Amino acid sequence: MAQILPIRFQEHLQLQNLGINPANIGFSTLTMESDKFICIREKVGEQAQVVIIDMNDPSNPIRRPISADSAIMNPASKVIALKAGKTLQIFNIEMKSKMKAHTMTDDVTFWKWISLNTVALVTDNAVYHWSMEGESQPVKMFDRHSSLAGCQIINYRTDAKQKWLLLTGISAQQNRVVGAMQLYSVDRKVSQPIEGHAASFAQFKMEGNAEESTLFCFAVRGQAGGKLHIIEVGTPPTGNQPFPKKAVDVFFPPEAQNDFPVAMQISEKHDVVFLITKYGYIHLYDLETGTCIYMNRISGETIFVTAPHEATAGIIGVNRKGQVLSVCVEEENIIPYITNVLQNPDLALRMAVRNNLAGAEELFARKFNALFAQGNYSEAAKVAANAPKGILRTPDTIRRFQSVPAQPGQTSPLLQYFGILLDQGQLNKYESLELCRPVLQQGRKQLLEKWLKEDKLECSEELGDLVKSVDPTLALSVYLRANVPNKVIQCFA
Amino acid sequence: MAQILPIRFQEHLQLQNLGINPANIGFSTLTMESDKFICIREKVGEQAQVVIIDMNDPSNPIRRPISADSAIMNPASKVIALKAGKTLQIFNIEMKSKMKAHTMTDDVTFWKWISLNTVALVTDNAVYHWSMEGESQPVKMFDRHSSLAGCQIINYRTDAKQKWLLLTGISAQQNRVVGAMQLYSVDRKVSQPIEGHAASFAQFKMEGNAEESTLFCFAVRGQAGGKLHIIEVGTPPTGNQPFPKKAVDVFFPPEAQNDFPVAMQISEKHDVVFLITKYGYIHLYDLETGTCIYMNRISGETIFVTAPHEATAGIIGVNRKGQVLSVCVEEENIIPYITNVLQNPDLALRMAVRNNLAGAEELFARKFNALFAQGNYSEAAKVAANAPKGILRTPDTIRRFQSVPAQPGQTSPLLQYFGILLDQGQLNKYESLELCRPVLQQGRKQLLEKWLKEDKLECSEELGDLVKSVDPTLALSVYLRANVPNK
Amino acid sequence: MAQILPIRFQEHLQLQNLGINPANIGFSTLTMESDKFICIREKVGEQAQVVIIDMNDPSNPIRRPISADSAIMNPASKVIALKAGKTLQIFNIEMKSKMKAHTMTDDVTFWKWISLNTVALVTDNAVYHWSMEGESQPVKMFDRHSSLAGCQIINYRTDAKQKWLLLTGISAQQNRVVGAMQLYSVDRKVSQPIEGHAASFAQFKMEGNAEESTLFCFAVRGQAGGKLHIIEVGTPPTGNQPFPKKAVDVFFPPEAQNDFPVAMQISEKHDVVFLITKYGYIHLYDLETGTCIYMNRISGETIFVTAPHEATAGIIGVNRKGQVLSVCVEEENIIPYITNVLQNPDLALRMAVRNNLAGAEELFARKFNALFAQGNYSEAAKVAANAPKGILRTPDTIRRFQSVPAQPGQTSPLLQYFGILLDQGQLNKYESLELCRPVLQQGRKQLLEKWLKEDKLECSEELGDLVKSVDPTLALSVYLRANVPNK
Secondary structure, eight states, X not given: OOOSOOEEEEEEXXXXXXXXXXXXXXXXTEEEEETTEEEEEEOOTTOOEEEXXXXXXXXXXXXXXXXXXXXXXXXXXXXXEEEETTEEEEEETTTTEEEEEEEOSSOOOEEEEEETTEEEEEOSSEEEEEESSSSOOOOOOEEOOGGXXXXXXXXXXXXXXXXXXXXXXXXXXXXXXXXXXXEEESTTOOEEEEEOSEEEEEEEOOTTOSSOEEEEEEEEEETTEEEEXXXXXXXXOTTOOOOOOEEEEOOOOTTSTTOOEEEEEEETTTTEEEEEETTSEEEEEETTTOOEEEEEEOOSSOEEEEEEETTTTEEEEEETTOEEEEEEEOTTTHHHHHHHTSOOHHHHHHHHHHHTOSSOHHHHHHHXXXXXXXXXXXXXXXXXXXXXXXXXXXXXXXXXXXXXXXXXXXXXXXXXXXXXXHHHSOBOSHHHHHHHHHHHHTTOHHHHHHHHHTTOBOOOHHHHHHHXXXXXXXXXXXXXXXXXXXXXXXXXX | OOSSOOEEEEEEEEGGGGTOOTTSOXXXXXXXXXXXXXXXXXXXXXXXXXXXXXXXXXXXXXXXEOOOSEEEEOSSSSEEEEEETTEEEEEETTTTEEEEEEEOSSOOXXXXXXXXXEEEEEOSSEEEEEESXXXXXXXXXXXXXXXXXXXXXXXXXXXXXXXXXXXEEEEEOSSSEEEEEEEEESTTOOEEEEOOSEEEEEEEOOTTOSSOEEEEEEEEEETTEEEEEEEEOSOOOTTOOOOOOEEEEOOOOTTSTTOOEEEEEEETTTTEEEEEETTSEEEEEETTTOOEEEEEEOOSSOEEEEEEETTTTEEEEEETTOEEXXXXXXXXXXXXIIIIISOOHHHHHHHHHHHTOSSOHHHHHHHHHHHHXXXXXXXXXXXXXXXXXXXXXXXXXXXXXXXXXXXXXXXXXXXXXXHHHHTTSOBOTTHHHHHHHHHHHHTOHHHHHHHHHTTOBOOOSHHHHHHHHHOHHHHHHHHHHHOOOOO | OOSSOOEEEEEEEEGGGGTOOTTSOSTTTEEEEXXXXXXXXXXXXXXXXXXXXXXXXXXXXXXEEOOOSEEEEOSSSSOEEEXXXXXXXXXXXXXXEEEEEEEOSSOOOEEEEEETTEEEEEOSSEEEEXXXXXXXXXXXXXXXXXXXXXXXXXXXXXXXXXXXXXXXXXXXXXXXXXXXXXXXXXXXXXXXXXXXXXXXXXXXXXXXXXXXXXXXXXXXXXXXOOEEEXXXXXXXXXXXXXXXXXXXXXXXXXXSTTOOEEEEEEETTTTEEEEEETTSEEEEEETTTOOEEEEEEOOSSOEEEEEEETTTTEEEEEETTOEEEEEEEOTTTHHHIIIIIIOOHHHHHHHHHHTTOSSOHHHHHHHHHHHHHHTOHHHHHHHHHHSGGGSSXXXXXXXXXTXXXXXXXXXXXXXXXXXXXXXXXXOOHHHHHHHHHHHHHTTOHHHHHHXXXXXXXXXXXXXHHHHHHHOSHHHHHHHHHHOOOOO
């Protein structure tokens, strides 16, 4: 079967161990706006309170009597947004002060922090955005599209720049839980309906572009089965190649009778899409190609709320038992898993270099060595310059390139390689020495002077000693940047 | 593949994020005597120090300049045992006082806390046990058997009662790593050699016995390949059926060229044996039958040290990258995984009831009605009394039992049932209302009292208003145990 | 003047910033039993309290209403000893419980923790020692000698082993303060009077002995003037050369009219005696020779209480303004200061090697090079094995020894050097390789096996590759020790 675990499945806390009534671990009584806090609304006895679990010391909840139709914590600060029917309030739990309130005209039918300081109020007819800053009041962003009329609103998301907003609701239409999404463009004041169950946006800088694309990923299970779509949203930064829209199907086994997507979070650190189904299944898809990397079942109960897990760049959620679960890529097993279990070494090397992950060292040496025969020193050096965890940025790799003669005409494979590196970035101690040694003989001061200024060489006492052999004056410069001891400077006395 | 994940796989820490030199993340510089601390010996600069990581706030190591050939922390307290060549020292990190020392005559060649307050010193010729308590000195327990001569000593274990001790060493044979264990009996002052790679002891109260057996499980990749053995050690408590020794083979895939067992820990909470191989593989075996439940690979690098993970009843270890990993049973997925992925409900139900594992309310709330719809109503009671999470401990059940076949000479199964629970512990509010009621219905305080003195009963206001018609002061107790208002 | 500053001078806390009445910053109201707490007795309003400053978070005193003629905290734990006239009490501030009390028969005229759990009660006639442990009661240790009759008792000290006890008092005799000390021998139940102002004991292992001497250092400014004396106390451990008693004068400038010693603390980490005078002056003396290293004035007000500063191995005290000051050796400046400012390079190299301090690297190479040139290869290797911070423990040194042509019968200067190292401790990766290579080429693991068991070699993948040949299991363990990837 599969033979290396590509993800980690962790259980950060078990809510009942905090003595939380399991009647209160649900959609309407439990919220998770970020991986920072969990907030439960409980009626202890005849009294109503709010239990706030700070995931950074979950062992110690914060309880407050607080009657509220709903409560949702800030994604990052001890600021809570309580809703009493139509009177919204934004209180500072931290210093018990009341930051700001507002009686809506109609009842907020779903709401949710969309950022460090803006709440999103979904009315029966419109979505607003309320900043927890100042005297400001709620600001309508758009009007609910009609495809979502009478829908149970389950989520609202935004792209990083809050220029594209997505609203989702589900219906039990004719014996299936059908999902309805409304994707509204802020800048182009337009709005369109998509059948979708779960989605998320992502910033993704394509190979060869200088700007991140803004992607919108969404999944659904329709008559034609479940599918996952990854499409760029809006107009590519000027000068960017566009991102080819993608579409992949998301499998459901027969046992997974009427399962359907329920949550999605994307790892910007690994460019992997995490999808959770109604019945507790989890899938990982490659964000750039939509390739399915892994599927399994982690929960039998439903994970009714989730959020990205910043520590691991994964996904964390809570299910009906009270388990606060999380899943993430095991950075040390995924490349090997794609190569050996997926038997997809091409996805593996891409994902590896793209994300600087390890496990494809043998494929990289292989690839370098291969290009070296063909004598494509230039392609060969691209590979050593970009392969992860500096696996080919070695002295031996310089000795390799140093060994092939400069036929009359073009540029040396070594100088070529050092070219790539100098572009790529900053060179080490060994590389700077090997780069400078010759040049220094060739009386080329100016050149090392620019490499220095443009800060491309990792100065060293040794690179300095070398230069002192040609420019004792140019030395001080490297030394003064090299972190040497006075003796080295006092010699210049 | 898996229609389900029966285990959790976690990372509790990433040592280099604590800026720990990865040259120091090894067998000889890193030790984990329990899941409570991790202790690294580092030479920062030209200076030597000890970094102590308290797993209960790993974010903040404790560093101290401390030259020591070796350092191992207490399994539970901030007491550290340092070794300078031949001079052992037991210092109190907590309040920086020196608790106790002792120059050994020969060099301790391996050592390790075997309990909250005893260190085990392994000499080239003998194993001693040193208590960190008092003026006492190291006390030889046995002499190294000869099969272990010239072996790299890799571990020393004990049974809970420290009546059985196990010493392990490995040797680079020709081109194989051969493990050599010495299983010494304390009470029966005898000692025997076993070829073993990894092992652990476990207390296990068999189905139908009143005492826990003491098992000794060990694994090896013999010329006969890998095998796992689970055997009882010593003489069964009196009245205990003996535990049938077991033997299962442990699989190694072809890719796992020359892998071999390296660590073992048993979950007493779930009766599952966790085995970790040299190449990063993990297996879970059923402790009572040796059945293999799960296998996978969690690490590419070697997990060179481990310990039971108390919080989860699993295993936690550290590998070469500095990852502090842990694996455990996902209590909510394992029964379903065995019944469905493993296809093995016999094991599943064994496991379920044996360990109070959820995941079988179905074929459980089934087995009952099974025997009811039969003529059997006393195995049905046992059945609806050991089913997990009180699943069938329902009134609808006692009811089913009250309307029980009233047939002469045969003990009443409602009362036979009321027996399992009685012999089990406290009866719930209701179960204790129908148990009692008739007794007092009879007008007997003699038994009511007894059960009460032993908390076998959860009182109510009912029982209150009940036991009252008989004698107050008894009811008062029952009424208080139940807690009612000033009227 | 000074080209370099040999000490650090720090302010740790301004007591008035903690809003402490400066009327209460005195001998009788402020106590400092260790650098761990400062304890002030204040009458806030009409109420009497005890302010306990935990130097590990001085920002937050602990206050308690507590009428007591006196209060002195434990040197290390939150245990306080309160004295109500004649009723001594030892309370646990931590968990507010009362640990132990005792009404003395006569009034304790001075008292003071002499250790983690013993208080010393000085009576008008006798000194006792009371352990804060158990039901035990105060235990007379001796009877005040008569030279100390009617003396203001200012201090009481002990040697580490509490076998020698010292009592000091002052009294004005006409114009000045005459210090009177009573040095009592516990073992030899004798006691003698010394004229002294301040003193302290120190454990000091002499060059060439295997046991630490117990020294007693004391200073005085009476009839011959100021002098400092360092003398061994008792009978040298068996096999120890005795410590030549020392005597140095302690200078007082003219402006320091009637100044006189007031406090002393010795750094065991640097073997430097810190002396504080009545008028705020500080002197540093070499403990072994009594050579005066440094003098200066740090306070104008009097530092009326002090204690050793563990963190820096210096001295910390409090003066009349409420400044909690401290002085210590600046480990990176002292050798250069002695060499260069004091111009005593011999003292500098000794102190440097003795106390393994940076700063004399060029003098050490020089010294090595010089002996090497002369052919004094054994002395040359002593120098490289003992020069501080591993300065000559380089491969070059090995290679310098490796240049010496052989000579039948004569043992190589290298093997000699490696001898010294192997005695002094363990060796690095290069030294272990150069030590083992030959031996190994003679397939004789019999040696390397002992060096290993001993922990004297620093393994490596290379030292391992060398061994793999000879013995496989020995390489397995050398690799295990040096710790290698799965290659």
